[PDB]
């Protein structure tokens, strides 16, 4: 109840994922893998996030131990399930 | 192209997005995707009519309410779903509807009743019987029995309001 409510997108999909405004990006990345089978399609080591701006070149790749509220996110932003890979 | 924006309504505990995963991703799990307002994108074709991909799934969150209230206003399509084993929800969607009718101003709005999870009919508390006795009460809100697990009437649902949005 009450928390961020961003659009953790996963290619066409748009499963809103509620996070604690101060959730660890390292956790917000561990809270999704527990959901949607297409999400746990690997380890957290090959799965990070990406705040796809309005032009993914503008978008970014957040951290982990950070805190969502770091971007002072609000609710229904635009987070994407991205490969941590390299 | 047609553009269908549906409001998947559901009580807390049912499975709103659960139906929007066997649908857009093709996967059903025991962990019911969250409750915040989630939409699902899927390009479809109705009767050979290419329809645009946007649907909305609102659910028991007062955070997204304002936003969840805006889709009632437009309410291009409503998919109210309860658990066939959950009366407590079947019985709640009854007011939540009045919230639609309240903004639409009528019940003549694209809409469908759904008793999904028929795979728990083994428990069946509210079936297409009460469901349709309810749909009837809703004015025969056209009901369907689905199973986001056995993927039953999971596609017909959106297929039933598009036929209505085609006013």
From Swiss-Prot, chain A:
It is found in: Cell projection, Ruffle membrane; Cytoplasm, Cytoskeleton; Cell surface; Cell junction, Focal adhesion. It comes from the Eukaryota. Coiled coil: none annotated. High molecular weight cytoskeletal protein concentrated at regions of cell-matrix and cell-cell contacts. Involved in connections of major cytoskeletal structures to the plasma membrane. With KANK1 co-organize the assembly of cortical microtubule stabilizing complexes (CMSCs) positioned to control microtubule-actin crosstalk at focal adhesions (FAs) rims. Part of a complex composed of THSD1, PTK2/FAK1, TLN1 and VCL. Interacts with THSD1; this promotes interaction with PTK2/FAK1 and VCL. Interacts with NRAP and LAYN. Interacts with SYNM. Interacts with ITGB1; the interaction is prevented by competitive binding of ITGB1BP1. Binds with high affinity to VCL and with low affinity to integrins. Interacts with APBB1IP; this inhibits VCL binding. Interacts with PTK2/FAK1. Interacts with PIP5K1C. Interacts with F-actin. Interacts with SVEP1. Consists of an N-terminal FERM domain linked via a short unstructured region to a large flexible C-terminal rod which contains 13 amphipathic helical bundles (R1-R13). The rod begins with a five-helix bundle (R1) followed by three four-helix bundles (R2-R4). These are followed by a series of eight five-helix bundles (R5-R7 and R9-R13) in which the N- and C-termini are positioned at opposite ends of the bundle, creating a linear chain. The four-helix bundle R8 does not disrupt the chain because it is inserted into a loop in the R7 five-helix bundle. This is Talin-1. It comes from Mus musculus (Mouse). The chain holds residues 1 to 86 of 2541 of the full protein.
Curated annotation (Swiss-Prot), chain B:
Keywords: ADP-ribosylation, Cell junction, Cell membrane, Cytoplasm, Disease variant, GTP-binding, Hydrolase, Lipoprotein, Membrane, Methylation, Nucleotide-binding, Phosphoprotein, Prenylation. The modification ADP-ribosylserine is found at residue 39. GO terms for biological process: calcium-ion regulated exocytosis; cell population proliferation; cellular response to cAMP; establishment of endothelial barrier; establishment of localization in cell; modification of postsynaptic structure; negative regulation of calcium ion-dependent exocytosis; negative regulation of synaptic vesicle exocytosis. Changing residue 64 to A: Abolishes complex formation with RAP1GAP. Loss GTPase activity. Activated by binding to the GTPase-activating protein RAP1GAP. Activated by guanine nucleotide-exchange factor (GEF) EPAC2 in a cAMP-dependent manner. SMART domains: RAB (SM00175), RAN (SM00176), RAS (SM00173), RHO (SM00174). The keyword GTP-binding applies. One of its GO terms (molecular function) is GTPase activity. Changing residue 59 to G: In THC11; likely pathogenic. This is Ras-related protein Rap-1b. It comes from Homo sapiens (Human). The lineage of its organism: Eukaryota, Metazoa, Chordata, Craniata, Vertebrata. The gene is RAP1B.
